[model samples]
Target chain A: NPAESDRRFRIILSDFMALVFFDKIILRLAREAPGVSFELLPLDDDPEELLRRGDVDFLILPDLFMSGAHPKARLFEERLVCVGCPTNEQLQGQLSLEQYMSMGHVAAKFGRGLKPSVEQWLLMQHGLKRRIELVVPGFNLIPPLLSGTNRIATIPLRLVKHYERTIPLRIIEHPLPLVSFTEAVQWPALHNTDPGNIWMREIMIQEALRMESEMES
Target chain B: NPAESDRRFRIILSDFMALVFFDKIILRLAREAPGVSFELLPLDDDPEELLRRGDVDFLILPDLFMSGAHPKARLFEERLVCVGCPTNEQLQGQLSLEQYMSMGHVAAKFGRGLKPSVEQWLLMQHGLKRRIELVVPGFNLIPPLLSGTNRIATIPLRLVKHYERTIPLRIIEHPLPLVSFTEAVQWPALHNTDPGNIWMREIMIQEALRMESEM
Candidate 1:
């Protein structure tokens, strides 16, 4: 076994699934565990106290931030888009809800006791606000604050279709009203039969079934 | 002074200059402080105890993680590249320091008490040690762990030329020794004459001189 190269694998999530499923789980961990090593932690605010003090081995998130005594799986299907800046002349057309809450927003502040992003607690459970004007701490810094500003960023339509294929964004369609989540993967019911946590949960459920069959073709 | 829209400007840095100088300082604070608002903090491990407990109003960084008692400026000129996967076949040529410390890296951990990047503390002040295999927290998640793998990622050549103009990244040239680093901006000699800390230090030294005249 590649001389047991110091086996270490600690993962907690949210870099929006490390930018939508960490390069297909580090490209099948560079051809099957090439000297294993992955720390990746950062979705805090006491995620079940780091899987009950095992100090994280996997938490990945959003089953509305799990914690019903461990054991979880289902890793994909998230929806919420909005972004902006395809020459944002205030996103020309269909973005009402009072022009998406009077525009000028660029949220994401999670760092230092995490929790806030279930689309900002479902826009504060519908009392909706949105006039943030830049806050960033990651969601890969919201496409450089929606490139050249008009600021919108609602986030995750597969991370604004992977930053609108290299940042120029402009996605629209999410004028609010929730329901569309599921991004599970909890673990730690006593090493849930530890064989390296059943081979990294079968490589994160086969990279979430290859990202839900490449978003259904 | 539209009731100074709750003036709350907190700055501290790193998300690689919040992705290269925060959208040109929020496109010039949305046309001259349109009801100002910005928090953007993250660069921990006691950055001089949050600019000596003024809980950050500016700290941008890399004057070798400064602290010669506040008052700083210069913010641009950083160098050290070496990203990978422009179909990295071990970067085809010129990368020897034993193939850049035996490849397969994708670092950047800087969280919970920061202090590692000055290019991972100049590769641990030259005892070097690559083969990180993935550690990410930010540097915009090291271009998705260097796309389809053969990792590397040394970082900051204007953030790999702004993710090599949309992530296909190859960059190279930074085989070992280190030098170029400036990214400054410290503040907090008691908010050096606060006029909203002299208008957010003249919009972060004019967006670090428009990122040193666009690099």
Candidate 2:
């Protein structure tokens, strides 16, 4: 019983509070399996510290947070979009480097996963400076803009498209120039060969890929 | 040309960065409709100010934010839940007045429409002595508890349940000794009867309720 009891696996997700979608999927999978007991460990001011603790069986981290020590992690990639109010027609299709630079942007305070890529593109192409207003945490940027009169923001395309229908919002066809993002599920090297941990990783990859496909459709 | 143009309707929503599931449903519906356009508005700071300016046609506001002048707005009544980390087992059953006061809780930013009933219950019963930590804005509290060691929070039941399944977390059965909450789909009173706005509200209620029922 002690050996079988030790077989139960746990995972620690290092993420921002804004990522509600990913959290929902993992909870569903955990409920499906009775033997597996998952624990969501909160991230410290620095996520790398949490990764070193070895308190968890697996770690779900964004691409920007991954270190070279964990190379075998599975990745789930998605694209980000530039969103704004519907009446702003000047931001229609295929934004030039200058246009991208001119628009105001909001940056997430927790991580710089996509910010570096966006900033590099703006500085290299258009010498125009970026005017950033607020550095808010999480994903509470869309709704106020739907009602308010703000001009621009770089958001996930799927989220902007969703807001367009239920609430009032517009999705700009031309997005700011930035590389695509990949959210990966990684585990400490110690747990690489553990049978239970392996199974959990497989399930996570399957679910992530499934969600990615759904978002694309 | 007028008819084709009429088919294209622009809509507004709250929050732009994080993707909530309810927002996802709205996006799917818009995608299915061939001639509709959508936009994301940042209402985290001052939603009322944005609504007054009439920047966009409609809004999806929580019940608490829809108080006072927004009471007459159309609403989609839904249940809210109290969420926290798995460690806080004491909050499992019905909470007493004294226990409610003593139990520490954290909530979203002051505004952004959480639940008035719960807020009132805490104040009326517990008074100012209760420690309610209003730290982050919108739905940012999830990561602090799940990823970190902090295991206490009260959030919408739908979102709480959704996250509980996908992420490592637990749901407290009793909801802070308060009644259920209803988040409404509100629009400016002036545009209350607009067909486009009406249809949009219907679609939102239908899909949101459907999701709740399915769960």
Candidate 3:
């Protein structure tokens, strides 16, 4: 299976897990199975829409990402914003729609695909896309990525106001409708019975619960 | 030698080389080499200076990067600039040294070393550096990287003004003394006669010449 092209697996996670799991799950995985390839992706919006596209194999996402009520794990949401550097004079003032579209966008993609954002998904319903100049895989990377540069990033809002203070970033208004939701893990109910999927589901659920406790305590 | 590290060989190049060699050199290499791992680096300045402390096997650099006077291929210099989004009103003003230092920097490193700049190298003779938030691997990546953000990058001018036009970027003074130089291929010199090194040097020199011509 490892040698055959047909036998492959693609696991998708958000910037949160990608930051954590790549160090935990995937790190240990490579040590045991050097033959298997993991095409990891970064999801900005929900993974459900992507899963429906057929190429997505597993989505470890927030609880309500596309209403992923399947419940292997649960998650919460963060607000979104447009970020730029303090020296970026334009960011010091109110942002305009034209100013938003005309400037180069720094996107956070899930995998090679810059997965749709809450903005992108909503925009898609009306057929709209911004000009994206750069794409990386981590949300935490946005502050560092856009600081000191003329580049801008649109991602979930900052909570701790940590990066905003330290990276000393500018928070400009996102030039679109705002949306927020939940996070969790979900699998096609059909895979509910397969032993491997079940194993994956259980481990992820336990981790999800553990993470939940850590945040709560 | 091929059997040595289980399967590892880290080779560094520049965006100048990765842009040209990724497919032609590295692509076919995948088909033939099949056994060893090849990690190619795209250098913004001469990672060569930071490299003497590490195990960098070879370098395709400027004629006098720290001290790489030998050559197979040659290149001229391009003026460096502080670039940003055209919409970044902050960029339209006259930039002083303090403004440049305070602005968050989007750096193009050899992989991710964030080694000091040609500016940093020059500054070291004096002791100063800038605040870098992001570290990327390509020069061309700098434009798009700073696209919608207020970040800035300091790099040599491009022969190809193409990305500048499409990305609608702004260019300004580099707040520091300008640095410019020539380009070429340099190895440990100790490996001068090793067949593998010789072959690598020859093929790379040919590619380097072709790249210089293209630009």
Candidate 4:
């Protein structure tokens, strides 16, 4: 019945999550539900309202942004890393606190009501401020901006690795104690019993495990 | 004074333009204005208000979104191109109207008050409705969605070429009679006399031309 039905799943997530697991999700869907489509909605001001209104099926958000009102499952855990151009001489190896703070940075800032990227927020929490040279909207833009510049970008490890294949990037561990965060898939409680919705969630959770395991190796 | 001063130029633009000309703009800035920085702000509900309030120094927007209250210059003109996975047999060459309309599409729909992408608008204008399989917030995300699927994406030619190097995309000429759109650089009248702003604008204009010429 699903094969003949044109069912669309609307999910709210950022480009970061899409860059990480969307390919895998779609690959699984290609095998399981070819008729199913996904609408990648942006994370708006009030996501909980969307859930209540049934405007969205799934919300992939980090621990910092997750609402406890919905039934959720942890997708994956990711740590922050410093990324720069391969030609950047300062990023030769492990950087010191002084060297890290001194270098110019290219960071992502969300629009309107969204908070800054997790890494930027963490630095602010510790009262540590790096010299920001450029601020772009999405994390995907960070890798491009760092291509010919000496600026450093503190972003997720999976994202850095994703771009490493196309863009020549030098990944360095953060000198500061930056904590890792978990991104989870949250859904409305009403739809938790729906078989189709459950199947999609299962695929996402399995894919998350695969991504995490792949990152482990 | 120019080399020592850390002057940051906040410009409003979308990821589409950033993907097209940001690297070139930065490359030029490296030689001409080493100390200058650029903050790429997102295009919000009221870009004109930002210009009026002087919150942003420059706004790079399409002709459809431009406000005539300020001084503006066209950066470049771009036509739409249909892109899909190289393995998509339907996209081997130029597509016909029927072929184009029959395929499911992966299109970008902006947030809130913003209109749909120009290509989508054009299709709607002609009373042509393609089956949109997926809708994303930005144009940059379109290339990735087309990698393993049979979906087609109608976007700017310059942007398609930019991603063609990284993503294995087959570019096909759009069958519809879609009009080309011009993206321009607009600045407030208040900063017209500022030498530094003028220099920055000059560099942007030149970089835009270089990108256009290169394309």
Q: Which candidate order results from sorting by lDDT in descending order?
A: 4, 1, 3, 2
Q: Relative to the unseen true structure, what is the C-alpha lDDT of residue A178 in candidate 3, on a scale of 0 to 100?
A: 51
- Least well predicted 10-residue stretch by lDDT in candidate 4 chain B: B118-127
Number of the candidate with higher TM-score, 1 or 4: 4
Q: How accurate is candidate 3 locally (lDDT)?
A: 0.54
TM-score for all predictions?
0.34, 0.41, 0.35, 0.49
Model 2, B38-79: lDDT tens digits are: 665544435555567766665565553443564234334545
- TM-score of chain B taken alone, every candidate: 0.34, 0.65, 0.58, 0.83
Model 3's DockQ score: 0.01
Give lDDT per model, in order.
Answer: 0.66, 0.51, 0.54, 0.70
lDDT of 1 by residue, A1-217 (tens): 4424558888888887876787678776776667888888877666787687787788877665466788888877676656688787867878765666666877665546222222222222122334456667867887876698777766667776676667768767644333355788887788998778887788788778877888989
Where is model 2 chain A poorest over a 10-residue stretch in terms of lDDT? A119-128
* Each prediction's DockQ against the real complex: 0.01, 0.01, 0.01, 0.01
Off by over 4 Å in 3: A1-217, B1-10, B14-16, B20-57, B62-79, B96-102, B109-141, B159-166, B174-177, B192-199
DockQ-derived CAPRI band for the predicted complex in model 1: incorrect
In model 1, what is the error at residue B169, expressed in angstroms? 15
lDDT of 4 by residue, B58-108 (tens): 888777555467888888887766667888787776766556667887766
Top model number, lDDT? 4
Error of 3 at B47 (Å): 7.1
* lDDT of candidate 1 over B33-146, digit per residue (tens): 778888887865566676777767777776645546877878677765556788867687786555666667765655442222222322221134424656667577878767
